[PDB]
Structures are given as structure tokens and as C-alpha cells.
Design a protein around this ligand. Sequence first.
Ligand SMILES: O=C(O)C[C@H](c1ccc2c(c1)OCCO2)c1ccc2ccc(OCC(=O)NC3CCCCCC3)cc2c1
Length: 290
Amino acid sequence: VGRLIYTAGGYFRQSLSYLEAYNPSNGSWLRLADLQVPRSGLAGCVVGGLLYAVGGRNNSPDGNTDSSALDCYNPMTNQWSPCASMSVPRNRIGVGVIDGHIYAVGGSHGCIHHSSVERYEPERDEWHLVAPMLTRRIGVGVAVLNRLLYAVGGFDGTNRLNSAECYYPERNEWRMITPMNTIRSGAGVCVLHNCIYAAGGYDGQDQLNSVERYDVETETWTFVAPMRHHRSALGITVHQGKIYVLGGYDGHTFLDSVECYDPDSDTWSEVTRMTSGRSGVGVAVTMEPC
Ligand SMILES: O=C(O)C[C@H](c1ccc2c(c1)OCCO2)c1ccc2ccc(OCC(=O)NC3CCCCCC3)cc2c1
């Protein structure tokens, strides 16, 4: 009990410093301590009850700087602290957590599209590089299932991608998995039960509302119910057995809508609205603040 969905950063006209937290139990939203540096295209994750904001870019009227930052937020103090920075800036990054360690995957730095991957150790406040992916990927979706790390879709600098790959930590090795049915850049990617879900994204032409899921046992991607809204660069997380998607860009608007997927009924329902429309947010779940 007492866990909240946190949304950090994002983009609307410019990159944003907002930290806001939604309580699915009573519908409430809390505005919390701003990020020190506004960022979009960042990823959020949680280790040991601390919320981490990783990478992104600060888009401002007076410049656009890609971020190597790792900042950590303590709900007990409502304060952000700087952690050790990554080896390179990573805009439109994907992250995943295995066994208390944060993996930062891919992302862009200027015109460079990274294949490189690095691993953070909270107990040592240190980053170290691991094996790079087989494909350069920005706007990549990353999730962890059964202590394996998945990198799904993205953009390699020339083509948007339906391909996907799996990292095996004990061999420090990446291998291709079955590609998705759909090209998706900027999808929301998460894990629910034994499947990796890829929701929305941009296929090169239109923002998508389709959702597909990868069953690790069958190695197949299957479509599930589509979302109510087309969305790319959306926030995504899982909480009490349901997927929550937040925000994104639908082609026309920066969405404020939050939708919830129930796998048992295979339905999406609109559950709340963010305080303002935005895309490119980092999302993660941890205990209530204060
Ligand atoms: O396919 C690609 O080249 C990359 C892909 C993308 C680029 C251009 C697009 C697009 C999607 O579909 C909307 C119209 O053209 C992408 C993927 C992930 C992102 C994550 C965060 C993120 O954070 C800043 C952000 O939200 N930017 C927003 C305005 C500019 C468009 C990008 C989105 C809205 C941005 C991401 C962008």
C-alpha cells in the first residue's frame, strides 16, 4: 500500500522540471520538488525506494543540452540530489533495473545515435560500460523480465525499428529476439506478468494507438486492445497488475490523458488527467512522499 505513480520532466513548448505524483487509490495529484534541471526525453526508475531521473535533454529558449545526469529523489525528504553522471549524454534514453543496478541504454548525443550501454551501482555511486547493443537505438523502450534486459524498437539514425534484442548479464552479450509486428519509435515499453508490452510510438508516418506484447515463452508478439488515444513519447509504468500510460503526443495535442490497461478484461480505461499536457516524461512507482 501507499505507492504512487511519479511523473518527472517532459516537454510542452519547452522541457519541463515538474515532479508530480498520482495516487490511483483516491485520484489525487501532488506537485513535488522540481528537477534541478528541466529535462525531456529522460527515463525514470526506482531502486531501494529512491526515484532516479536518468539522461534526457534540456530544451530551452536559449539552448538544447543532452544530459548525462543521474539525479535521485528521496520521497522522505522531497529533495533531489545529484548522483554520478553517465559516461555520455543520452537523450531519448531507455532504462531498466536488474538486481539493484540501473542500466542506461542507447539514446542520442547531438547527431550520434548510441549503441552503448552502461550500468550504475547505487552502493558505489559509480557507472561502468557493458557490452553495446547490436543496433544503435534512440527512443528505445527498455524493460526487464526474469532478470534479462530488453531493448525494443527506437530509431538508429536512418530507419525507425521494429527489431528488438535481449541482454544476458552473465554473458555480457546481446542477442536479437523476434521483431515486433509494428515499427515503433518512442513507444512505452514495460513488463506485466510474463510479457513485454509495447504501446504506441511513432512508425515513421503516424502516432500509434496499437499495443503488442511479447511472450518470452512463445517468442511471439501479439496485439492486445488498442489504447483510446494515439500516443508517441509517452510515459509508462505498471502498478497493481495494470499498465498506466501518461501523456505523449498524438499528432495534434500534447496529451494530458492517463489510460489504464487491465489484462484480465483486455480493455483500456481513462482514469485521470495530468495537470497539463506533455510528452517525453519519465515515470516510476515508489512510496508516498513526506
Ligand atoms: O522516431 C524518432 O526520430 C524519435 C521519436 C520521434 C521523433 C519525431 C517525431 C515523433 C517521434 O513523433 C512525433 C513527431 O515527430 C522520439 C522517440 C522517443 C522520444 C522520447 C522522449 C522525447 O522527449 C522529447 C519530446 O517529447 N518531444 C516532442 C516534440 C518533437 C517530436 C518528438 C516527440 C514529442 C522525444 C522522443 C521522440
